[PDB]
Design a protein around this ligand. Structure first.
Ligand SMILES: [Ca+2]
Ligand SMILES: [Ca+2]
Ligand SMILES: [Ca+2]
Ligand SMILES: [Ca+2]
Ligand SMILES: [Ca+2]
Ligand SMILES: [Ca+2]
Ligand SMILES: [Ca+2]
Ligand SMILES: [Ca+2]
Ligand SMILES: [Ca+2]
Ligand SMILES: [Ca+2]
Ligand SMILES: [Ca+2]
Ligand SMILES: [Ca+2]
Ligand SMILES: [Ca+2]
Ligand SMILES: [Ca+2]
Ligand SMILES: [Ca+2]
Ligand SMILES: [Ca+2]
Ligand SMILES: [Zn+2]
Ligand SMILES: [Zn+2]
Ligand SMILES: [Zn+2]
Lengths: 101, 325, 313, 98, 313, 98, 325, 101
């Protein structure tokens, strides 16, 4: 498990996340722009860079019960994401790095 | 130098706490109240102590830590103050700014109360202890203070940001005074050369409240690993020809433009956000003491006006009791 | 009427919190943070709800509570506010000022946020509900408000005191404006007649914080049972000749005087600020002006009464 | 409010210390009692109530906290036979009367 | 009485100093620092003496001068003070408040240092001298003081205004304590009857500073000649039918209104603080309270007069 | 206060600039006189006096400052034949009357 | 390093001015008012410029300058500010802080008015100009500022002292905040390394006042020549065996003790000195705005009390007109 | 002219200088302690060290007319005093240096 393609490719989760601010649900989006929407909606700081804290917030998350992941499990997941995607060893994940995998 | 963000030693908003009410990768003890936007290390109550330490030890040769905090108090005199530690053991409880004495590491103390009576406070005091020197609370630690600078960080319109950088055995503390909302206006405060610290230690931040009361919020705590430009391995041939980076950057920018346009043209379609400007959230302390005085007059006027109208009737009806008779 | 102190439905400093960490005879839940000096029902954080309710039920025909509290905010607007309830069951959680909806009792709400947008807030609203009416949070309960007065209690220099008295089917809310540290400086705010509440109920306080953050501290909560002067039995022959009191009072006064004298010289046996002192002097001067104007009003009323009695003949 | 609880010298001696310390181990039964009455009136109203008495009998001087029902029963029993005017307050007239 | 403005014995802003560096029709000597807005007669430095005196002599039977000034001190005690002289010759240098002793005229002294140690100072003292009495600096001239009132004028928020009027052998000193920016808010301070001063004399102002330093700024000095309503000849047939004034006044008002209208939109054609505004609001509120108390006093006095006229019946 | 001294356009044209600027070289003799009377009343009292006139006829626009006696004589001559109510002030009734 | 006091480039009280009203070895121009205790370079009046420069050029490789000054203002916002120059030519008149623009040297500016509107003021700005860069007054010189620190130096209970040290081509500014009456409590403000300045230059200090008014007093200006410990010639055999130094030191100490005893037993024989403590000379600005408010009440009370007694008579004599009738 | 012995040895000038603070005039003092009094009274700063400024104040001086010395003349006298008495090149003149000449 990790930053799988289907986890980002869930149109329903993206649509239910963009509600309130982006009020235009359309069930015809390509699998390209929805990954982008994921990247924009999970960058809370507005710096256009995904770091470990934002990724862990996305992975743990709260949707309405569900049990929480263990701290060691979350550490392993984020470390596996960073060790295989942060080519520039900055800690942050650029959109190009995100699109690579 | 080269900076790498370390997620295992950081916390930031707006999702600071999880659904179980704990800060990820951090252990909080004492009177700390972690909320989603900030961690209130010590609220505005008498005799409060709080601390948040890292769960896992950090092994960095050179590092940099950026802390955003607010110390807000009603009066002009505050107590006790804030502290940022890089220690060997997690001392989450004690008498030194809400954490234990006799620590094996380095400690930066934001002292708001001048116990020494020398008018040298508020101050930023760097204290490095091997584990055998007690903190002289009655003299603000001036005897064992490695370095100090005299700054004010209480009741500012914007959060105060501090950068503490350990690089080539020199510890540099830079303070953003918080007058401006810019996040990159740091001004130099202090430095200590040939500073020695343990190779592996726990980051932490604590706060304590004495006779006076202040609120010690911490909004973010960003930890960066600093590597020398020459010792860092380049590891080339990993950019995958760098063409897709340029091919994706303009697509990302085009999205940013489109989403900004969509937000712009749907932010006014159904205007329901009340909003909260910073002008409505900031007010000077002394000016506050003026405003209440003004309110004290707004009562007194009424007690005249009614009285005035009372005298009015004694002018009118008495005439009706004069001409009739 | 005759007032009887009730410890069972009261908390007060400076030993408010016992050794175990809770306030005696009172059950607190939510984000309440009790301490030795006061109870912070809801701290200066976003989306905070807190409530302190009595453990044991109260059975009073007529009662009077005095609540000392502060609502402190950095900004000019605060949310949501404080609430004093006399209910039938302790809700202990809900969206109506930190307590449950559909309460069966009486609630005094010190609303500080104008959700109706009519510039009426801050206000004190007395709302009664049998248990079938939902509180209208979107308009500060203006439709079901039994009575309301527009007074300010935020960022006052001294604690705001409220006296809520239910006596002979009449509920009276008197508010200290908070500009003087006197204990008996109450001003009339609101009253309602023919108010019906169950004889069995729990007292409680609560506070809620919205988008803007305010600290809602409650310093004391004294509950008094009020009995009619005629219905109370006299039960005579219980003062034990009324002579020991007279023999002991002057002795106790003399000993406390000599203790004060001892403290006077032994305070210095082994050992205010400018600006703050000036502000205290300013507030004392305003209080002097207020008192003198009130005394002039009383004198003018007496002159009016004398003139009416003179012209009556 | 038993007699021996208020007729002990070490408690009041260690309590008043800090502002007044006049060591004299010859206090009359009405002297240490009067000191006890003076120090436990936190509000400065020269009057004892249920809350002041409840903090008196528990204190912070280890032992587990007494039961809520037991504390309620003992304070109600104290208030039942000592209070004479049924004011909800305990005065030194009633205190020295019983 | 009838007032005539005199330019020859006056200085006023905001063009007080000409191009050559001196105030017109006035000769200043010592440490006076005339500027565009005001004259700093003696700056906040140790042992400073300054004085501004009139060049040409003044021959008025009755006169009235209005002096606007500020005395600002960092400390709570100031020295020595200001002085307004109507003399016979310009001394221009001396130890009596920056001016010479044995003056033949009348001097109003605003003493701010209590050399007598009687806590009377600050005070306003009217001293007259024919030219044979030395001013007693060691006791603030208590022996030779014709009149004195104890009013404060140091570090006031607004300029202190003093009206000194000599009319029909009577000198009246009226002080605006400088708490309101109104031009006609004078209060009575002192008066002396049968005061004799020579008809030929020079007006002047002066200031001196001792061990403690105060800034003695004089903003304006307007001198008015007062003549009796009956002694002034009418000289009729000089208004030129009194119709051109009525034909022109409304036209001038219309043009000034249209100029204000033009400035209203052309101020923004090509482009107060918190705390200071709050202080201004506080002082205006104090002024409104004072005005309403004065109006209540006038109403009460009118009621008293009506009651006396009624009991007369 | 000669007629040509107040009936020149460039002086007020460079004077009023800074807050109001409406370039219009067709001003009536009562219009530029109107502006001249409006701006020289520094005190805002809608009234001219000796001191305002003294700073008016001198200004800061090189030429040596005028003699004190000459200035006194010319302002006395101005005030003698223009003021009719003998108030020590000059109003536009008196100003336009002469 | 080794310090030598230079009298030719200094002035200090309490005999600052001579009998002819000029400062020895210094030329003052503009609105400077030199008094016996201090030089008021620009008084609290609108549009004032003043400067005091050195008459003789000074040729020091390394030097230290200690300036004691006060900037006192009535309001919370002051203008324009103070400046200390080490230039090539004198700068008596000009638009830059009371001195001429286009100076070939170094200039330390104490700026009290934030013209840039960035809330960066009051500030200490080090500007070094070769003779071709104008001073950007509308932007507080932030574009051409070599260094800057944010300190407050207006309305302090004690004089503010600044140490400016040029040593090994590094200009170091340390500012004493003036909270404490100690003369050796300097705190670091700024430094500029590899700073180049003319070998010979004039010292000078200037002050300017804009729309708002402040008083810019200078109490002392002490200039020291700094020499390296290795380059300084020792020139031995000049102490004359050093025995008389020890033989005279204790005699001097004994005389100091005797004179102190005489002054102690004489100062109470005829007590006539009034004295002026520092508590009676210092008061905070905001508290001042409170105190006048208090005075504003002391008037209002009177207007009630008399009114009160007036109502008193209408209670008394009316009774005398009621029982009689 | 300069720091001559008779200039320091004028008992009348010393006595008239110490008046107001030292009112014990006695015309029997040795020529040793009067130099001490001179040194103490001409050190206004209280640092027990005579620099150029205090010496120039002492030399120019005001006693109650007399013409003032030229600035170049005062510079020459002070430089001559410093070049022949300041042995340690400190700028200040210690009491031992004062007693040397
Ligand atoms: Ca990010
Ligand atoms: Ca990356
Ligand atoms: Ca401290
Ligand atoms: Ca300290
Ligand atoms: Ca509401
Ligand atoms: Ca409302
Ligand atoms: Ca009590
Ligand atoms: Ca009782
Ligand atoms: Ca005096
Ligand atoms: Ca006196
Ligand atoms: Ca005018
Ligand atoms: Ca006229
Ligand atoms: Ca500036
Ligand atoms: Ca700036
Ligand atoms: Ca010296
Ligand atoms: Ca030497
Ligand atoms: Zn989601
Ligand atoms: Zn002109
Ligand atoms: Zn001498």
């Amino acid at each position: 498990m990790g930053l799988d393609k289907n986890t980002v490719h869930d149109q329903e989760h993206i649509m239910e996340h963009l509600e309130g601010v982006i009020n235009k649900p359309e069930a015809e989006m390509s699998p390209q722009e929805l990954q982008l929407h994921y990247f924009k909606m999970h960058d809370y700081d507005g710096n256009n860079l995904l770091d470990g804290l934002e990724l862990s917030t996305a992975i743990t998350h709260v949707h309405k019960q569900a049990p929480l992941m263990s701290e060691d499990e979350l550490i392993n997941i984020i470390d596996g994401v960073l060790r295989d995607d942060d080519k520039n060893n900055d800690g942050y994940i650029d959109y190009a790095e995100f699109a690579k995998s | 130098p080269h900076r790498r963000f370390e997620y295992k030693y950081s916390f930031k908003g707006p999702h600071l706490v999880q659904s179980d009410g704990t800060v990820p990768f951090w252990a909080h003890a004492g009177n700390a109240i972690p909320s989603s936007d900030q961690i209130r290390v010590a609220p505005s109550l008498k005799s409060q102590r709080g601390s948040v330490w890292t769960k896992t030890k950090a092994a960095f040769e050179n590092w940099e830590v950026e802390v955003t905090f607010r110390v807000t108090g009603r009066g002009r005199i505050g107590a006790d103050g804030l502290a940022i530690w890089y220690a060997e053991n997690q001392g989450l409880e004690g008498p030194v700014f809400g954490s234990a004495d006799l620590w094996n590491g380095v400690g930066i103390f934001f002292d708001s109360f001048d116990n020494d009576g020398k008018k040298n406070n508020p101050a930023i005091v760097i204290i490095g202890n091997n584990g055998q020197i007690h903190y002289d609370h009655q003299n603000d630690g001036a005897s064992q203070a490695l370095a100090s600078c005299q700054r004010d960080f209480r009741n500012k319109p914007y959060p105060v940001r501090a950068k503490i950088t350990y690089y080539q055995n020199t510890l540099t503390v830079m303070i953003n005074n918080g007058f401006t909302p810019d996040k990159n206006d740091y001004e130099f405060c202090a430095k200590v050369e040939n500073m020695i610290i343990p190779a592996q230690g726990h980051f932490g931040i604590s706060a304590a409240t004495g006779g006076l009361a202040d609120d010690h919020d911490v909004l973010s705590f960003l930890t960066f690993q600093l590597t020398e430009p020459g010792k860092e391995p380049p590891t080339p041939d990993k950019e995958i020809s760098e063409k897709e980076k340029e091919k994706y950057q303009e697509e990302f920018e085009h999205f940013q433009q489109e989403l900004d346009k969509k937000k712009e043209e749907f932010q006014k379609g159904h205007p329901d956000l009340q909003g909260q400007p910073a002008e409505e959230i900031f007010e000077s302390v002394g000016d506050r003491e003026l405003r209440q005085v003004f309110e004290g007059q707004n009562r007194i006027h009424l007690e005249i006006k009614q009285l005035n109208r009372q005298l009015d009737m004694i002018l009118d009806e008495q005439r009706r009791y004069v001409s009739s008779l």
